[PDB]
Amino acid sequence: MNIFEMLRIDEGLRLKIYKDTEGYYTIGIGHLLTKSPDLNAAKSELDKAIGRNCNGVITKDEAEKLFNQDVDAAVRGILRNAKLKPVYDSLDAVRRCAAINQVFQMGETGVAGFTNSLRMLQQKRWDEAAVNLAKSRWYNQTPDRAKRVITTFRTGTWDAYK
Ligand SMILES: Cc1ccccc1O
Numbered sequence: 001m002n003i004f005e006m007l008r009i010d011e012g013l014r015l016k017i018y019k020d021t022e023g024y025y026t027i028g029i030g031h032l033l034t035k036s037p038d039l040n041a042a043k044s045e046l047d048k049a050i051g052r053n054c055n056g057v058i059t060k061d062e063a064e065k066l067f068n069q070d071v072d073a074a075v076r077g078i079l080r081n082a083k084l085k086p087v088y089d090s091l092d093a094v095r096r097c098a099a100i101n102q103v104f105q106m107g108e109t110g111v112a113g114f115t116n117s118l119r120m121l122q123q124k125r126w127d128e129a130a131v132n133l134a135k136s137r138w139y140n141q142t143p144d145r146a147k148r149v150i151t152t153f154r155t156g157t158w159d160a161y162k
Contacts, residue, residue, distance in 0.1 A: 001158040003071060004149060005099045005102060009161060011065060017042055017056045021142055023035065027056075028063030059100045074104050079129050081108055095121070098152035104144075106138060113137075121153065130154040 011030030020026040023095070025033045025042035033045040046054050050062055062143075078084045078099065088099050103111055111118075114136070121128035130150050133139065138145040151160035 001161050003044070003100050004067070006097055006101060006152075006158075006161055007067070008069065010101060010148070012104075013059065015058055015063060017046065026057060027066075029067040029070075031063070031066045070104065071100065073101055077108055078103060083115075084108070084111065084118070087122045090122050092126075092156050094156045094158065095153055098149050101149050101152075102138075105142075110138070126154045126156075 013029050014027065017025055017027050017033065018041070020030070020032065022035075024035050025039065025045075026075070027033060027046060031049070033042040033049070036042065041056070043056050046056065049066060050058060051152055078088050080102065084099075084103075088096060102114075114133070115128055117132045120132055123129075130153060133150050133153060134146065136146075148160035152158070
């Protein structure tokens, strides 16, 4: 297991424009196109992202290319963020994957609400952190995925991903 395999499980792979769990147009392996309800705006974002007229459909290789860009940018964003970097760098590599997963899903603005959890994670109070992480809109809206990510934060193992 690694961050790619982990996110592939949590996000799936779809080659045609679909709506994510929040109702937002998306493609590939959780590549958000736009929060706009305009399908045409979504198709334009897709064409911009791929560099060709896709008419709402991409290939597996194209999906994987966006995925690599998205994972990389998520990590680089964490490192640029003064509130996230110290906590991230305090973690072991497996727990860092849980961090990347969380930011990939909810963005840095979503993780902004997790200040208290992040503190407990930095303190390595793993059971307390796990309890605090579940007291969230995140957990209530996507509980089965959040349970896996939280188990990863709690244990520093990949037990939840097989
Ligand atoms: C971005 C991030 C960093 C550390 C812990 C959790 C998390 O979501």
